C-alpha cells in the first residue's frame, strides 16, 4: 500500500537530477562489453554463450556483482557484510543450474591455473606486511598456532568417522588432510582492515596471526602422499614421505638468495625502481608456484614466495609502503574470479540429497576442535580472555586447499579402478565440498567488530 | 698496436668503480628470462626453442637489441640514428637464416595479429595530437598530398614494368596498388620529435603532415579488389569497387558517434578519468580494426580509429595533454615487435638472386616521382622552397601495407590455380619486398636534420 507513496518520493528525490552519479553509474555498467567484444573478434564463438573465455569472463562478471549486492543494501543490523562469500556464491550459484552451466565450460587446466595464480597476490601481501620484532619472540608459539589445532581437528574427524561411517585405521587419514587446510586469501584482507583499525597491531597481532598458514597444508599433503601410497597403495609411501618432506626443505631452502639481492641492492635511483620490483616479484612468486608444480611440489612455491616477499619488504622498508599500493589496486579484481572459480565446482544433488543432516556432525564437532585448540596452543604467553578468544577465532577459516585436492581423491580411485575407493572417493568429495561453503567467510564475517569487542585502539 | 694502450686505459678510467650504471645495466640484462620462465611453467615447449611465444619474445627481444645498437656507438658524423631500420633489421635478419630461423616458427594469424594492433597506438596518438585550426583552411591541399603524389607514383611504376618487364594493360594496376601506401608509424615520432624541436609547429606544419596517411591505403586495397576481379576474374568487379567504397563511407560515418560523447559527458570527476579513457580508446581502436576485419573492411577501422581520436581530444584539449604519456610510455615496447614481424618475411634467394640490378628501376624512379609531384600538390598555398621540399620528403615513407598485401597476390595466384599468374605474383612478391626494405627509414633519417636546416624555431 505505502510502497507507492514511497516510490513516489523516491521519485521526487530524484527529480531534482543527480545527474552526476547517475553519469558515472551509466558508464560504469556501459564500458562492460569492450574486451568481450574485443577477444570475440580475436576468436570468434569463444566469446559467444559455448565459448570458454565468455564463460570466463561472465564468471568474473557476476562475481564482483554478487559480492556487492551481498552487503549492498541491508546489514544484519549490527554488522558490515563479507563481499567474498558472495563473490564465491555467484559462481557456485552458476555451477548448480547447469541446464544454463552449459554456456560456461572453462577449460580445466585453464581454470586451475588462474585458481592457483590468484592466490600469490595474497601471498605477496601477506609477506611485505610482516614485521620481524614480534614474532622473532613469538616464533615457536606461532608454529604451535600453526600445527596443534588443525591436526588435532584432523584426526579428531578421523575418528569419528572412523567410528560413524566406518573408517578403516589406516584411511581416516585422508579425511583428516581434507579437513586440515587454511585459506589466508579471506584472513588477510581481515587483518590488514584491522591494522587500519589500529586496534591489534598495538601488539602487531594481525600480522602475527596471518602469518601462520604456511605449513600445514604441506603436512596434510605429505600424509596424503603416503597415505596413498598406503590405503590406495600408490608407490612407496617411505618415498611419498620423502616426497613431502623435501618439497618442505627445498621451499623454506630456495627462497633465501632471493632476498640476499632484492633486500640489498636493487639500486635506488632507478626510475621505475618500486614499478619494477612489483611485477618482479609477482613473477618470481608464480615462477615459484609453477615451477614447484612442473616438479611436483606444489607447496614449495608459497614458502619461497612469503620468505622473498618479507626479505625484500625489510629491505624495502622504507619503500615497502608504496609498493604496496599496486598490489592492492590490482588485487581488487583476482579475488572475484577466484571465488567463482572456487565455487563452479559440484552441486548438492551429484554427493547426496539425503543423509545431509546425519552426516555433517564429522565436520561441525571439528570445527569447534580447532577453536579451543587454538586457545590451548599459547600455554604462557601473555594474553588475556579477549585475546585468547581473538586468536582462537582467527584461525578457522578453511576453504582453499579443500577445493585444491578435495575430488582428487575419487578421481584417484576411478583411474586406478578401486570400486570400494571410488565410494569412499565419493563420500570424501562430499566431505570435502562441505568443508568450504560455509568455514571461511562466516568466520570472517565476526572480525571486524570483534577486533573492537576485544582489542584496543589509541585516541 | 694502439689498442691495447686504449684498453688499458679504459680500464684504469673503469677502476674507478661506476659501480651505479654498472648494477643498472646488470639488472637490466639479469631479468629479462622472468616471462619466458612463467609462460614455460604455464605451456612448456612453448617457450623453448622449438616453440612459438620463445620465437615472439626472442623476437621482441632481439629487435629492441637491434635498434639501440643501430645508434649507440656511432654517428654519420652529422646526424642521430633511425633506431627503428635496425629494430626491422633484427627481424628480417631472423627470416634470412632459416637453419635457426626454424626455432622462431610464430603463429601466422597470432603474428598477422600483432602486426595489425601494433599500428593502432601510432594511429590513436596521430589522433589526439591534431590541430584542427591550421587544417581547416588547408583541407583540399592536404587531400591533394595524400591523393595525388601516390596515384601518379602507382601509374608511373605501372607503366614502366608494363614496358619493362610486361605487364598487360589492364594488370599492371597492381603493381600500382603495391607501390601506392604510407607507412606513419615512423613518420608520427618524427613529428612529434620536431614538434617538441618546435620548428614546424610554428605554422603546425608536422600535425598537417602526418594527418595525410589516411585513404591512400583504401584506394590501394579498393583498386585491389576491382583488379583481382578483372584480371584476376574474381567474382563481380563492380561489386569489388562497391566494396572498397562502402569501406571508405562507413570508416568516415561510424567514428563520429564516438565523439558525440567522450568529447562531451565523459564526466570530469571520474577517479582514473584519464587513465580509464587512454585504454578505453585504445580498445575502441582495436574494437574498429578487427571488427571490419571480420566484416571484411579493414580499412574502415582506422578512419573510425582517427576520427574518434581527434574527437575526443578536442575535448580532452586540457586533459589530452596528460593521457598522451601513457599511450608514449605504452608505445615503447610495441614498435620493435612489429618492425621485426615486418622483417621476418622472407629472403632475397626466394626471391631472385639475379635480374636485381635490372629490375629495381621501375621502383627507383617512382621513389623520385613521388617527391617533387608532392611538391606539385601545392598549386598556390604559401610555402617557400624549403617549406616545399621539406613537404615533399615527407611524403616518402612507404613500408606497412607493402607487407601487409604483399604476397597476397601470389596466394590467391596459388589458391585459384593460374600458373602465369603464380609467376606474376613471384614478381610482384618481389618487389613489393623490395619497396619496404630502405623506403620509410632512409626516409625519416633526414628529417631531424631538414626541420632545422628547413623550419624556423623560437629563441
Known sequence: P?????????????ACPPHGLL?????????????????????????????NLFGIIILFYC??????LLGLIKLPTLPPLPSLLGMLLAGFLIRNIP???????????????????????????????????????????????????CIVEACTSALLAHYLLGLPWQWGFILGFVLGAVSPAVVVPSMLLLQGGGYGVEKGVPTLLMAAGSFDDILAITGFNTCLGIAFSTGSTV????????????????????????????????????????????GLSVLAVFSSVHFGFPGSGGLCTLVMAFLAGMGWTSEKAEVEKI??????????????LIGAEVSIASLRPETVGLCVATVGIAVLIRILTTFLMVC??????????????????????????????????????????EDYGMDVLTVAFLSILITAPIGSLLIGLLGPRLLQKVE
Chains 1, 2 share one sequence.
Open 380 to 421: 604462557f604467553a601473555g594474553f588475556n580472555l579477549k585475546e585468547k578468544i581473538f586468536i582462537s577465532f582467527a584461525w578457522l577459516p578453511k576453504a582453499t586447499v579443500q577445493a585444491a585436492i578435495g575430488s582428487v581423491a575419487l578421481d584417484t580411485a576411478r583411474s586406478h579402478g578401486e570400486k570400494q575407493l
Open 239 to 282: 618415498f611419498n614421505v620423502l616426497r613431502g618432506v623435501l618439497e618442505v626443505v627445498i621451499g623454506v631452502a630456495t627462497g633465501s638468495v632471493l632476498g640476499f639481492f632484492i633486500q640489498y641492492f636493487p639500486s635506488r635511483d632507478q626510475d621505475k625502481l618500486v614499478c619494477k620490483r612489483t611485477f618482479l616479484v609477482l
Open 99 to 149: 541446464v544454463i552451466n552449459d554456456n560456461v565450460q572453462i577449460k580445466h587446466k585453464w581454470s586451475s591455473s588462474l585458481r592457483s595464480i590468484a592466490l600469490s597476490i595474497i601471498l605477496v601481501r601477506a609477506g611485505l606486511g610482516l614485521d620481524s620484532k614480534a614474532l622473532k619472540k613469538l616464533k615457536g608459539v606461532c608454529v604451535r598456532l600453526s600445527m596443534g589445532p
Open 23 to 51: 553519469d558515472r553509474v551509466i558508464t560504469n555498467v556501459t564500458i562492460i562489453v569492450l574486451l568481450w567484444a574485443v577477444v570475440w573478434s580475436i576468436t570468434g564463438s569463444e566469446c559467444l554463450p559455448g565459448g
Open 2 to 14: 505505502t510502497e507507492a507513496n514511497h516510490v513516489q518520493r523516491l521519485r521526487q528525490m530524484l
Open 327 to 340: 598490489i592492492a589496486v590490482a588485487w581488487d579484481i583476482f579475488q572475484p574470479l577466484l571465488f567463482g
Open 63 to 68: 562475481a564482483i556483482i554478487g559480492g556487492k
